[PDB]
Curated annotation (Swiss-Prot):
Assigned EC number: 3.4.21.64
This protein's encoding gene: PROK
The name this protein goes by in its record: Proteinase K
GO CC annotation terms, alphabetical: extracellular region
Enzymatic reactions: Hydrolysis of keratin, and of other proteins with subtilisin-like specificity. Hydrolyzes peptide amides
Binding site for Ca(2+) 2: T16, D260
Organism: Parengyodontium album (Tritirachium album)
Annotated function: Hydrolyzes keratin at aromatic and hydrophobic residues.
Residue ranges of every copy of the Peptidase S8 domain listed in the record: 7-279
Cofactor: Ca(2+)
Residues of the whole record sequence present: 106 to 384 of 384
Keywords recorded for this protein, A-Z: Calcium, Disulfide bond, Hydrolase, Metal-binding, Protease, Serine protease, Signal, Zymogen
Sites where the protein binds Ca(2+) 1: P175, V177, D200
Active site positions, chain numbering: D39 (charge relay system), H69 (charge relay system), S224 (charge relay system)
Top EC group: hydrolase
Amino acid sequence: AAQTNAPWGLARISSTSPGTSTYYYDESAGQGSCVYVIDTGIEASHPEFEGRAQMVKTYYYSSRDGNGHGTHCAGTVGSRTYGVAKKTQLFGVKVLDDNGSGQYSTIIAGMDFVASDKNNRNCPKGVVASLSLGGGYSSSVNSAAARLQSSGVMVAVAAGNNNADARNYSPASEPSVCTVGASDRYDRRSSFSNYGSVLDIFGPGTSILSTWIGGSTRSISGTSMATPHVAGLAAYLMTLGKTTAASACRYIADTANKGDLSNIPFGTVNLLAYNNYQA
C-alpha cells in the first residue's frame, strides 16, 4: 500500500532518504495488534480512528483526553491518515491529566494495568505500549516499564525533550525497553531530543502532524511524537511476524537506516526507524 501526501514522518520510516511524501507500507497495516497509548487518553470518537480506538482505563475523573497529547500520539500509532499501523487496535490508558502531567505512582499503576489488562484483549499479533511521557530518573518508573516489557508487551518510551543524556530520565533510562529519540525532516537530531547510550532508535519527532482532540489535527514536536512512530512500527512488524514483543526493539534497530542522522553525539546510536517495505 502507498499513502500519498503522508506526513513527513510516515514517509520517512518507509524511505532510506529524507524529503519524500509517500508512506509505503504493507496492506496488513498492523491488523491484529494492539497498542496501549499510555498518555492523556484518546478521543476514540475521532473519525481518523474509525472505531479502532477505545479508552480502557483512566486515573482521573474522566476518560476524556482534555489535552490532545494522547489523541495525537495514538493518531501517529494507528490513525488512518497520520498513523504507522493504520489497522491496529488502540487502547487508551489515561495516566496523564489534561495538563499532560501525572504522578509516578499513577504512571507505574498504568503500566501495571496494561500488563494485566492485555490478558483480557484480543491481540493475536502481539501487544505494544507507547509511552509519550517521562520525568526524572526513577528506579520505580524504570522497573515498571521493565515489568510491562517482560510481561510480553513491546514498550516504546520517549528519550525526553531535555537535550541531555537520557540516563537521567524515566522510563527513558530503563535498559530493556525501547528508548526513542526524535529527528526532524532533514535527518537532523531534533534540537530537543535527548541522546545517550540508553537510546535504542530515533523516530520522526519534529513537527509531527497527527490527530487532535475535537476531531481536529495538529502538528507538534517532541520525543513524545517519535515514540508512537516506533510503537506503530513495532505493531506493524509484529503483525507481519517479522519480530516479537521481546525482540521488536532490537529488530527495529537492526533494520534501521544507519548513519543517516546529523548531530548524533558520540556514543549515541545513529539509527532511524525504517520498515524496509518492498513491493
